[PDB]
Amino acid sequence: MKQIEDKAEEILSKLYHIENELARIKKLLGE
Amino acid sequence: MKQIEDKAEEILSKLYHIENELARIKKLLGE
Amino acid sequence: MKQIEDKAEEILSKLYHIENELARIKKLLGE
Amino acid sequence: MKQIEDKAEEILSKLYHIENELARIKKLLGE
Ligand SMILES: [Cl-]
Ligand SMILES: [Cl-]
């Protein structure tokens, strides 16, 4: 459970990374 | 635990957003 | 909990979708 | 529950794979 929250956090932190990599690809293609 | 269900919701919702990003990308590539 | 498993399943099913959309973009760019 | 922790692991691992896809993409775009 405290380990669950650690894994939740890693999961969110990967999910913002991915959002953000994707946002930068969309920006580039749209240039 | 509904804290854990809460987190799963928050997860999916991020994944929905990610899928919208990729729908924009795919259009910009004419898919 | 049975609802947790439902949300897990949706989460996996979005994650394979995303993997797969991404695999098809990589294929296209690499052509 | 370690079934739930198990699932979270399986989640992250998919997200790692997704990040590898996007590293290939980004290179193909010369980022
Ligand atoms: Cl939901
Ligand atoms: Cl892990």
Side-chain angles (χ1 to χ4, degrees):
Chain A
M1 221 298 191
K2 178 68 99 216
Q3 287 309 317
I4 295 189
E5 301 160 355
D6 314 4
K7 290 320 169 228
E9 288 165 11
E10 320 173 55
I11 273 160
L12 288 149
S13 143
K14 267 358 200 163
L15 277 167
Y16 301 136
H17 195 32
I18 283 159
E19 275 187 346
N20 285 343
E21 305 169 265
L22 281 173
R24 197 195 170 188
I25 290 154
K26 177 185 101 88
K27 212 169 44 178
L28 310 179
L29 294 178
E31 315 162 344
Chain B
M1 211 62 121
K2 82 170 149 168
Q3 181 183 346
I4 290 169
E5 188 172 26
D6 288 16
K7 194 49 43 152
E9 284 173 337
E10 174 188 5
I11 297 162
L12 189 41
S13 169
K14 312 286 184 249
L15 298 170
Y16 281 113
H17 182 229
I18 293 157
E19 271 192 358
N20 285 353
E21 294 182 94
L22 285 155
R24 293 183 244 118
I25 285 174
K26 276 155 40 223
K27 296 208 182 66
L28 298 172
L29 295 171
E31 268 172 49
Chain C
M1 221 298 191
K2 178 68 99 216
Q3 287 309 317
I4 295 189
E5 301 160 355
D6 314 4
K7 290 320 169 228
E9 288 165 11
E10 320 173 55
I11 273 160
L12 288 149
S13 143
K14 267 358 200 163
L15 277 167
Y16 301 136
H17 195 32
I18 283 159
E19 275 187 346
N20 285 343
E21 305 169 265
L22 281 173
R24 197 195 170 188
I25 290 154
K26 177 185 101 88
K27 212 169 44 178
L28 310 179
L29 294 178
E31 315 162 344
Chain D
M1 211 62 121
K2 82 170 149 168
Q3 181 183 346
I4 290 169
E5 188 172 26
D6 288 16
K7 194 49 43 152
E9 284 173 337
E10 174 188 5
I11 297 162
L12 189 41
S13 169
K14 312 286 184 249
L15 298 170
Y16 281 113
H17 182 229
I18 293 157
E19 271 192 358
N20 285 353
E21 294 182 94
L22 285 155
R24 293 183 244 118
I25 285 174
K26 276 155 40 223
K27 296 208 182 66
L28 298 172
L29 295 171
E31 268 172 49

mmCIF file of all heavy atoms in Angstrom, chain A residues 1 4-5 8-9 11-12 15-16 18-27 29-30, chain B residues 1 3-4 7 10-15 17-22 24-26 28-29:
data_model
loop_
_atom_site.group_PDB
_atom_site.id
_atom_site.type_symbol
_atom_site.label_atom_id
_atom_site.label_comp_id
_atom_site.label_asym_id
_atom_site.label_seq_id
_atom_site.Cartn_x
_atom_site.Cartn_y
_atom_site.Cartn_z
ATOM 1 N N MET A 1 0.873 -1.263 0.000
ATOM 2 C CA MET A 1 0.000 0.000 0.000
ATOM 3 C C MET A 1 0.857 1.241 0.000
ATOM 4 O O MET A 1 0.766 2.040 -0.932
ATOM 5 C CB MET A 1 -0.980 0.098 1.157
ATOM 6 C CG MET A 1 -2.386 0.633 0.771
ATOM 7 S SD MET A 1 -2.473 2.241 0.125
ATOM 8 C CE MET A 1 -4.231 2.653 0.099
ATOM 9 N N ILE A 4 2.075 0.592 -3.102
ATOM 10 C CA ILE A 4 1.119 0.906 -4.105
ATOM 11 C C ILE A 4 1.241 2.448 -4.495
ATOM 12 O O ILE A 4 1.217 2.856 -5.668
ATOM 13 C CB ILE A 4 -0.315 0.502 -3.626
ATOM 14 C CG1 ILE A 4 -0.373 -1.025 -3.459
ATOM 15 C CG2 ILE A 4 -1.361 1.009 -4.591
ATOM 16 C CD1 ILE A 4 -1.731 -1.620 -3.204
ATOM 17 N N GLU A 5 1.358 3.272 -3.503
ATOM 18 C CA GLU A 5 1.415 4.710 -3.740
ATOM 19 C C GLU A 5 2.656 5.035 -4.365
ATOM 20 O O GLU A 5 2.684 5.927 -5.177
ATOM 21 C CB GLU A 5 1.329 5.479 -2.463
ATOM 22 C CG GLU A 5 0.054 5.188 -1.696
ATOM 23 C CD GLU A 5 0.250 5.576 -0.242
ATOM 24 O OE1 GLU A 5 1.466 5.974 0.085
ATOM 25 O OE2 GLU A 5 -0.818 5.489 0.461
ATOM 26 N N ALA A 8 1.762 3.996 -8.094
ATOM 27 C CA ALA A 8 0.925 5.115 -8.569
ATOM 28 C C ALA A 8 1.614 6.374 -9.009
ATOM 29 O O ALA A 8 1.339 6.864 -10.048
ATOM 30 C CB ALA A 8 -0.247 5.539 -7.523
ATOM 31 N N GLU A 9 2.474 6.925 -8.120
ATOM 32 C CA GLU A 9 3.364 8.017 -8.450
ATOM 33 C C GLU A 9 4.276 7.881 -9.640
ATOM 34 O O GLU A 9 4.441 8.840 -10.446
ATOM 35 C CB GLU A 9 4.260 8.263 -7.200
ATOM 36 C CG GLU A 9 3.550 8.916 -5.961
ATOM 37 C CD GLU A 9 4.447 8.733 -4.710
ATOM 38 O OE1 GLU A 9 5.593 8.345 -4.804
ATOM 39 O OE2 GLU A 9 4.013 8.819 -3.656
ATOM 40 N N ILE A 11 3.575 5.785 -11.940
ATOM 41 C CA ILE A 11 2.653 5.609 -13.115
ATOM 42 C C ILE A 11 2.264 7.093 -13.662
ATOM 43 O O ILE A 11 2.339 7.420 -14.858
ATOM 44 C CB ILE A 11 1.513 4.916 -12.747
ATOM 45 C CG1 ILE A 11 1.752 3.318 -12.874
ATOM 46 C CG2 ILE A 11 0.320 5.055 -13.800
ATOM 47 C CD1 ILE A 11 0.845 2.529 -12.116
ATOM 48 N N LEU A 12 1.938 7.843 -12.739
ATOM 49 C CA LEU A 12 1.554 9.443 -13.031
ATOM 50 C C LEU A 12 2.682 10.012 -13.505
ATOM 51 O O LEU A 12 2.644 10.668 -14.600
ATOM 52 C CB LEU A 12 0.968 10.080 -11.876
ATOM 53 C CG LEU A 12 -0.438 9.466 -11.791
ATOM 54 C CD1 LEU A 12 -0.864 9.384 -10.471
ATOM 55 C CD2 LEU A 12 -1.440 10.252 -12.654
ATOM 56 N N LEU A 15 3.006 9.078 -17.140
ATOM 57 C CA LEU A 15 1.876 9.554 -17.872
ATOM 58 C C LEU A 15 2.004 11.066 -18.279
ATOM 59 O O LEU A 15 1.756 11.465 -19.398
ATOM 60 C CB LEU A 15 0.614 9.370 -16.970
ATOM 61 C CG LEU A 15 0.091 7.929 -17.081
ATOM 62 C CD1 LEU A 15 -0.890 7.757 -15.972
ATOM 63 C CD2 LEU A 15 -0.464 7.494 -18.538
ATOM 64 N N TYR A 16 2.455 11.886 -17.277
ATOM 65 C CA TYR A 16 2.861 13.329 -17.673
ATOM 66 C C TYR A 16 3.964 13.407 -18.566
ATOM 67 O O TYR A 16 3.929 14.231 -19.444
ATOM 68 C CB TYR A 16 3.227 14.093 -16.370
ATOM 69 C CG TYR A 16 2.055 14.187 -15.241
ATOM 70 C CD1 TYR A 16 2.367 13.969 -13.920
ATOM 71 C CD2 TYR A 16 0.888 14.665 -15.548
ATOM 72 C CE1 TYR A 16 1.402 14.124 -12.923
ATOM 73 C CE2 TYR A 16 -0.134 14.714 -14.676
ATOM 74 C CZ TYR A 16 0.114 14.409 -13.353
ATOM 75 O OH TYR A 16 -0.884 14.589 -12.431
ATOM 76 N N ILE A 18 4.692 11.266 -21.039
ATOM 77 C CA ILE A 18 4.209 10.853 -22.240
ATOM 78 C C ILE A 18 3.341 11.872 -22.893
ATOM 79 O O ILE A 18 3.520 12.241 -24.017
ATOM 80 C CB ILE A 18 3.404 9.434 -22.079
ATOM 81 C CG1 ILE A 18 4.332 8.242 -21.941
ATOM 82 C CG2 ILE A 18 2.596 9.310 -23.271
ATOM 83 C CD1 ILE A 18 3.759 6.958 -21.310
ATOM 84 N N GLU A 19 2.469 12.499 -22.067
ATOM 85 C CA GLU A 19 1.585 13.622 -22.484
ATOM 86 C C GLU A 19 2.450 14.665 -23.085
ATOM 87 O O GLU A 19 2.092 15.444 -23.961
ATOM 88 C CB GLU A 19 0.913 14.106 -21.254
ATOM 89 C CG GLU A 19 -0.293 13.349 -20.902
ATOM 90 C CD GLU A 19 -1.100 13.929 -19.747
ATOM 91 O OE1 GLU A 19 -0.640 14.808 -19.003
ATOM 92 O OE2 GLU A 19 -2.303 13.443 -19.659
ATOM 93 N N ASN A 20 3.578 14.921 -22.368
ATOM 94 C CA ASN A 20 4.353 16.028 -22.717
ATOM 95 C C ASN A 20 5.197 15.760 -23.959
ATOM 96 O O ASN A 20 5.375 16.630 -24.787
ATOM 97 C CB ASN A 20 5.318 16.415 -21.598
ATOM 98 C CG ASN A 20 4.647 17.150 -20.366
ATOM 99 O OD1 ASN A 20 3.583 17.660 -20.354
ATOM 100 N ND2 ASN A 20 5.389 17.120 -19.334
ATOM 101 N N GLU A 21 5.795 14.515 -24.080
ATOM 102 C CA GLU A 21 6.499 14.140 -25.316
ATOM 103 C C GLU A 21 5.478 14.260 -26.486
ATOM 104 O O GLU A 21 5.768 14.733 -27.598
ATOM 105 C CB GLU A 21 7.140 12.751 -25.203
ATOM 106 C CG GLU A 21 8.060 12.578 -24.033
ATOM 107 C CD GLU A 21 8.549 11.064 -23.722
ATOM 108 O OE1 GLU A 21 7.929 10.414 -22.886
ATOM 109 O OE2 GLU A 21 9.562 10.679 -24.225
ATOM 110 N N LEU A 22 4.282 13.797 -26.259
ATOM 111 C CA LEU A 22 3.320 13.781 -27.363
ATOM 112 C C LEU A 22 3.015 15.267 -27.709
ATOM 113 O O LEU A 22 2.699 15.538 -28.798
ATOM 114 C CB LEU A 22 2.069 13.081 -26.949
ATOM 115 C CG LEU A 22 2.123 11.481 -26.961
ATOM 116 C CD1 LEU A 22 0.902 11.165 -26.374
ATOM 117 C CD2 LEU A 22 2.354 10.915 -28.504
ATOM 118 N N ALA A 23 2.954 16.194 -26.661
ATOM 119 C CA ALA A 23 2.487 17.545 -26.931
ATOM 120 C C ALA A 23 3.569 18.153 -27.864
ATOM 121 O O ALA A 23 3.242 18.847 -28.773
ATOM 122 C CB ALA A 23 2.360 18.329 -25.663
ATOM 123 N N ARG A 24 4.812 17.915 -27.516
ATOM 124 C CA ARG A 24 5.983 18.375 -28.377
ATOM 125 C C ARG A 24 6.085 17.769 -29.780
ATOM 126 O O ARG A 24 6.508 18.401 -30.695
ATOM 127 C CB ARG A 24 7.208 17.984 -27.628
ATOM 128 C CG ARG A 24 8.581 18.675 -28.039
ATOM 129 C CD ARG A 24 9.753 17.929 -27.458
ATOM 130 N NE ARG A 24 11.053 18.392 -28.003
ATOM 131 C CZ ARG A 24 12.251 17.808 -27.770
ATOM 132 N NH1 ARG A 24 12.331 16.684 -27.031
ATOM 133 N NH2 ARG A 24 13.375 18.309 -28.305
ATOM 134 N N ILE A 25 5.618 16.542 -29.976
ATOM 135 C CA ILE A 25 5.540 16.048 -31.342
ATOM 136 C C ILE A 25 4.446 16.792 -32.079
ATOM 137 O O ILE A 25 4.584 17.034 -33.249
ATOM 138 C CB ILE A 25 5.329 14.479 -31.300
ATOM 139 C CG1 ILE A 25 6.595 13.842 -30.812
ATOM 140 C CG2 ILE A 25 4.769 13.794 -32.608
ATOM 141 C CD1 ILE A 25 6.491 12.490 -30.111
ATOM 142 N N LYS A 26 3.278 17.021 -31.447
ATOM 143 C CA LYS A 26 2.156 17.619 -32.157
ATOM 144 C C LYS A 26 2.577 19.008 -32.583
ATOM 145 O O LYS A 26 2.240 19.408 -33.626
ATOM 146 C CB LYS A 26 0.981 17.603 -31.163
ATOM 147 C CG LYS A 26 -0.309 18.190 -31.506
ATOM 148 C CD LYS A 26 -1.306 18.121 -30.170
ATOM 149 C CE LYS A 26 -1.389 19.555 -29.393
ATOM 150 N NZ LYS A 26 -2.502 20.428 -29.994
ATOM 151 N N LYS A 27 3.258 19.751 -31.691
ATOM 152 C CA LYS A 27 3.791 21.145 -31.903
ATOM 153 C C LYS A 27 4.688 21.145 -33.129
ATOM 154 O O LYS A 27 4.530 21.989 -33.966
ATOM 155 C CB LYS A 27 4.648 21.584 -30.664
ATOM 156 C CG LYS A 27 4.767 23.148 -30.135
ATOM 157 C CD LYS A 27 5.497 23.160 -28.643
ATOM 158 C CE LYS A 27 6.852 22.227 -28.337
ATOM 159 N NZ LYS A 27 7.643 22.189 -26.984
ATOM 160 N N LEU A 29 5.055 18.643 -35.662
ATOM 161 C CA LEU A 29 4.352 18.363 -36.859
ATOM 162 C C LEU A 29 3.561 19.641 -37.302
ATOM 163 O O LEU A 29 3.537 20.016 -38.463
ATOM 164 C CB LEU A 29 3.461 17.124 -36.676
ATOM 165 C CG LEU A 29 4.113 15.780 -36.446
ATOM 166 C CD1 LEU A 29 3.028 14.761 -36.242
ATOM 167 C CD2 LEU A 29 4.909 15.393 -37.677
ATOM 168 N N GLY A 30 2.971 20.378 -36.393
ATOM 169 C CA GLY A 30 2.089 21.465 -36.804
ATOM 170 C C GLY A 30 2.777 22.736 -37.271
ATOM 171 O O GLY A 30 2.125 23.662 -37.816
ATOM 172 N N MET B 1 -10.539 -0.590 -1.152
ATOM 173 C CA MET B 1 -10.179 0.864 -1.051
ATOM 174 C C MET B 1 -10.598 1.691 -2.235
ATOM 175 O O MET B 1 -10.344 1.421 -3.442
ATOM 176 C CB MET B 1 -8.709 1.116 -0.870
ATOM 177 C CG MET B 1 -8.349 2.317 -0.104
ATOM 178 S SD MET B 1 -8.851 2.508 1.689
ATOM 179 C CE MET B 1 -7.034 2.693 2.429
ATOM 180 N N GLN B 3 -9.668 5.022 -2.129
ATOM 181 C CA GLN B 3 -8.456 5.769 -2.550
ATOM 182 C C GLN B 3 -7.779 5.142 -3.858
ATOM 183 O O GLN B 3 -7.270 5.842 -4.734
ATOM 184 C CB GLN B 3 -7.416 5.842 -1.419
ATOM 185 C CG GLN B 3 -6.187 6.621 -1.834
ATOM 186 C CD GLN B 3 -5.047 6.688 -0.791
ATOM 187 O OE1 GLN B 3 -5.254 6.354 0.379
ATOM 188 N NE2 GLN B 3 -3.846 7.125 -1.215
ATOM 189 N N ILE B 4 -7.757 3.803 -3.952
ATOM 190 C CA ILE B 4 -7.083 3.100 -4.972
ATOM 191 C C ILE B 4 -7.930 3.162 -6.213
ATOM 192 O O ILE B 4 -7.419 3.432 -7.214
ATOM 193 C CB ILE B 4 -6.672 1.596 -4.542
ATOM 194 C CG1 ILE B 4 -5.538 1.669 -3.474
ATOM 195 C CG2 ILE B 4 -6.347 0.835 -5.764
ATOM 196 C CD1 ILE B 4 -5.190 0.370 -2.757
ATOM 197 N N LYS B 7 -7.536 6.535 -7.778
ATOM 198 C CA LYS B 7 -6.288 6.663 -8.465
ATOM 199 C C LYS B 7 -6.384 6.057 -9.891
ATOM 200 O O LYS B 7 -5.917 6.650 -10.915
ATOM 201 C CB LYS B 7 -5.189 5.983 -7.629
ATOM 202 C CG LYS B 7 -3.725 6.326 -8.076
ATOM 203 C CD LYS B 7 -3.375 7.709 -8.288
ATOM 204 C CE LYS B 7 -3.906 8.847 -7.194
ATOM 205 N NZ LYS B 7 -2.846 9.887 -7.301
ATOM 206 N N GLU B 10 -8.012 8.190 -12.183
ATOM 207 C CA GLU B 10 -7.227 9.430 -12.452
ATOM 208 C C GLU B 10 -6.227 9.028 -13.570
ATOM 209 O O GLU B 10 -6.179 9.651 -14.589
ATOM 210 C CB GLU B 10 -6.492 9.950 -11.238
ATOM 211 C CG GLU B 10 -5.552 11.156 -11.566
ATOM 212 C CD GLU B 10 -4.638 11.598 -10.403
ATOM 213 O OE1 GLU B 10 -4.610 10.960 -9.356
ATOM 214 O OE2 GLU B 10 -3.814 12.527 -10.552
ATOM 215 N N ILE B 11 -5.812 7.820 -13.441
ATOM 216 C CA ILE B 11 -5.033 7.075 -14.467
ATOM 217 C C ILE B 11 -5.683 7.051 -15.817
ATOM 218 O O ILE B 11 -5.096 7.433 -16.745
ATOM 219 C CB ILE B 11 -4.410 5.809 -13.882
ATOM 220 C CG1 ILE B 11 -3.434 6.059 -12.809
ATOM 221 C CG2 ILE B 11 -3.566 5.101 -15.078
ATOM 222 C CD1 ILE B 11 -3.217 4.862 -12.058
ATOM 223 N N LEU B 12 -6.877 6.475 -15.934
ATOM 224 C CA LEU B 12 -7.622 6.383 -17.137
ATOM 225 C C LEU B 12 -7.855 7.625 -17.758
ATOM 226 O O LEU B 12 -7.829 7.782 -18.991
ATOM 227 C CB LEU B 12 -8.949 5.653 -16.658
ATOM 228 C CG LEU B 12 -9.857 5.212 -17.742
ATOM 229 C CD1 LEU B 12 -9.258 4.604 -18.947
ATOM 230 C CD2 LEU B 12 -11.056 4.347 -17.175
ATOM 231 N N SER B 13 -8.138 8.704 -16.885
ATOM 232 C CA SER B 13 -8.434 9.957 -17.412
ATOM 233 C C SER B 13 -7.275 10.563 -18.133
ATOM 234 O O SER B 13 -7.325 11.121 -19.298
ATOM 235 C CB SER B 13 -8.921 10.903 -16.196
ATOM 236 O OG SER B 13 -8.967 12.202 -16.714
ATOM 237 N N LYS B 14 -6.050 10.386 -17.521
ATOM 238 C CA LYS B 14 -4.804 10.686 -18.283
ATOM 239 C C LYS B 14 -4.584 9.932 -19.678
ATOM 240 O O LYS B 14 -4.079 10.500 -20.627
ATOM 241 C CB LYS B 14 -3.575 10.579 -17.513
ATOM 242 C CG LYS B 14 -3.561 11.304 -16.090
ATOM 243 C CD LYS B 14 -3.461 12.689 -16.153
ATOM 244 C CE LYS B 14 -3.346 13.353 -14.689
ATOM 245 N NZ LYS B 14 -4.586 14.089 -14.432
ATOM 246 N N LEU B 15 -4.818 8.619 -19.665
ATOM 247 C CA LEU B 15 -4.882 7.848 -20.849
ATOM 248 C C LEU B 15 -5.875 8.311 -21.847
ATOM 249 O O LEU B 15 -5.525 8.400 -22.995
ATOM 250 C CB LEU B 15 -5.044 6.414 -20.450
ATOM 251 C CG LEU B 15 -3.863 5.736 -19.578
ATOM 252 C CD1 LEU B 15 -4.483 4.343 -19.121
ATOM 253 C CD2 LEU B 15 -2.690 5.580 -20.393
ATOM 254 N N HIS B 17 -6.724 11.464 -22.166
ATOM 255 C CA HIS B 17 -6.131 12.651 -22.737
ATOM 256 C C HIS B 17 -4.990 12.292 -23.830
ATOM 257 O O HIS B 17 -4.820 12.921 -24.859
ATOM 258 C CB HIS B 17 -5.404 13.463 -21.632
ATOM 259 C CG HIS B 17 -4.831 14.712 -22.202
ATOM 260 N ND1 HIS B 17 -3.526 15.147 -22.009
ATOM 261 C CD2 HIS B 17 -5.423 15.627 -23.012
ATOM 262 C CE1 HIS B 17 -3.349 16.272 -22.685
ATOM 263 N NE2 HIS B 17 -4.463 16.533 -23.365
ATOM 264 N N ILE B 18 -4.172 11.331 -23.463
ATOM 265 C CA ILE B 18 -3.140 10.808 -24.318
ATOM 266 C C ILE B 18 -3.701 10.367 -25.717
ATOM 267 O O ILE B 18 -3.188 10.645 -26.703
ATOM 268 C CB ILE B 18 -2.306 9.766 -23.660
ATOM 269 C CG1 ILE B 18 -1.445 10.283 -22.522
ATOM 270 C CG2 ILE B 18 -1.520 9.042 -24.661
ATOM 271 C CD1 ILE B 18 -0.965 9.351 -21.449
ATOM 272 N N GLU B 19 -4.806 9.756 -25.669
ATOM 273 C CA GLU B 19 -5.508 9.327 -26.920
ATOM 274 C C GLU B 19 -6.023 10.428 -27.731
ATOM 275 O O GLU B 19 -5.925 10.380 -28.911
ATOM 276 C CB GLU B 19 -6.667 8.352 -26.463
ATOM 277 C CG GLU B 19 -6.079 6.876 -26.412
ATOM 278 C CD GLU B 19 -7.074 5.837 -26.273
ATOM 279 O OE1 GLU B 19 -8.244 6.329 -26.173
ATOM 280 O OE2 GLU B 19 -6.673 4.574 -26.325
ATOM 281 N N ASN B 20 -6.495 11.498 -27.083
ATOM 282 C CA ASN B 20 -6.715 12.758 -27.813
ATOM 283 C C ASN B 20 -5.519 13.415 -28.406
ATOM 284 O O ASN B 20 -5.505 13.888 -29.518
ATOM 285 C CB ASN B 20 -7.342 13.730 -26.756
ATOM 286 C CG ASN B 20 -8.697 13.471 -26.463
ATOM 287 O OD1 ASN B 20 -9.359 12.616 -27.125
ATOM 288 N ND2 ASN B 20 -9.273 14.340 -25.459
ATOM 289 N N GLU B 21 -4.395 13.459 -27.699
ATOM 290 C CA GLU B 21 -3.201 13.923 -28.312
ATOM 291 C C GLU B 21 -2.915 13.163 -29.577
ATOM 292 O O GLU B 21 -2.551 13.750 -30.551
ATOM 293 C CB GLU B 21 -2.043 13.874 -27.332
ATOM 294 C CG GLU B 21 -2.133 14.789 -26.154
ATOM 295 C CD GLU B 21 -0.901 14.733 -25.193
ATOM 296 O OE1 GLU B 21 0.101 15.583 -25.316
ATOM 297 O OE2 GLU B 21 -1.044 13.892 -24.216
ATOM 298 N N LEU B 22 -3.032 11.815 -29.518
ATOM 299 C CA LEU B 22 -2.598 10.994 -30.649
ATOM 300 C C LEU B 22 -3.543 11.080 -31.853
ATOM 301 O O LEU B 22 -3.075 11.051 -32.992
ATOM 302 C CB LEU B 22 -2.633 9.468 -30.253
ATOM 303 C CG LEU B 22 -1.497 8.984 -29.326
ATOM 304 C CD1 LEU B 22 -1.851 7.721 -28.457
ATOM 305 C CD2 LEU B 22 -0.399 8.838 -30.293
ATOM 306 N N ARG B 24 -5.064 13.971 -32.699
ATOM 307 C CA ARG B 24 -4.484 15.175 -33.336
ATOM 308 C C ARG B 24 -3.222 14.879 -34.153
ATOM 309 O O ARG B 24 -3.039 15.213 -35.425
ATOM 310 C CB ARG B 24 -4.197 16.226 -32.211
ATOM 311 C CG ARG B 24 -5.467 16.837 -31.495
ATOM 312 C CD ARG B 24 -5.211 18.044 -30.331
ATOM 313 N NE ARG B 24 -5.635 17.679 -28.916
ATOM 314 C CZ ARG B 24 -4.822 17.576 -27.754
ATOM 315 N NH1 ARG B 24 -3.498 17.843 -27.677
ATOM 316 N NH2 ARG B 24 -5.398 17.225 -26.631
ATOM 317 N N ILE B 25 -2.305 14.154 -33.525
ATOM 318 C CA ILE B 25 -1.092 13.719 -34.297
ATOM 319 C C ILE B 25 -1.388 12.989 -35.605
ATOM 320 O O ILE B 25 -0.796 13.270 -36.702
ATOM 321 C CB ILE B 25 -0.169 12.863 -33.338
ATOM 322 C CG1 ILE B 25 0.517 13.778 -32.395
ATOM 323 C CG2 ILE B 25 0.772 12.045 -34.073
ATOM 324 C CD1 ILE B 25 1.398 13.056 -31.237
ATOM 325 N N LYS B 26 -2.242 12.021 -35.507
ATOM 326 C CA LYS B 26 -2.586 11.166 -36.635
ATOM 327 C C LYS B 26 -3.222 11.885 -37.789
ATOM 328 O O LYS B 26 -2.889 11.587 -38.918
ATOM 329 C CB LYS B 26 -3.525 10.015 -36.199
ATOM 330 C CG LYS B 26 -2.683 8.758 -35.578
ATOM 331 C CD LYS B 26 -3.387 7.777 -34.555
ATOM 332 C CE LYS B 26 -4.868 7.399 -34.843
ATOM 333 N NZ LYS B 26 -5.706 7.435 -33.511
ATOM 334 N N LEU B 28 -2.749 15.385 -38.214
ATOM 335 C CA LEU B 28 -1.538 16.027 -38.797
ATOM 336 C C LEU B 28 -0.589 15.161 -39.723
ATOM 337 O O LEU B 28 0.231 15.685 -40.514
ATOM 338 C CB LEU B 28 -0.659 16.681 -37.756
ATOM 339 C CG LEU B 28 -1.169 17.816 -36.923
ATOM 340 C CD1 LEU B 28 -0.084 18.003 -35.923
ATOM 341 C CD2 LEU B 28 -1.391 19.025 -37.743
ATOM 342 N N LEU B 29 -0.697 13.855 -39.625
ATOM 343 C CA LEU B 29 0.028 13.015 -40.497
ATOM 344 C C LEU B 29 -0.909 12.562 -41.635
ATOM 345 O O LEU B 29 -0.535 11.709 -42.395
ATOM 346 C CB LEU B 29 0.619 11.850 -39.679
ATOM 347 C CG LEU B 29 1.688 12.087 -38.593
ATOM 348 C CD1 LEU B 29 1.944 10.842 -37.804
ATOM 349 C CD2 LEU B 29 2.973 12.518 -39.112
#
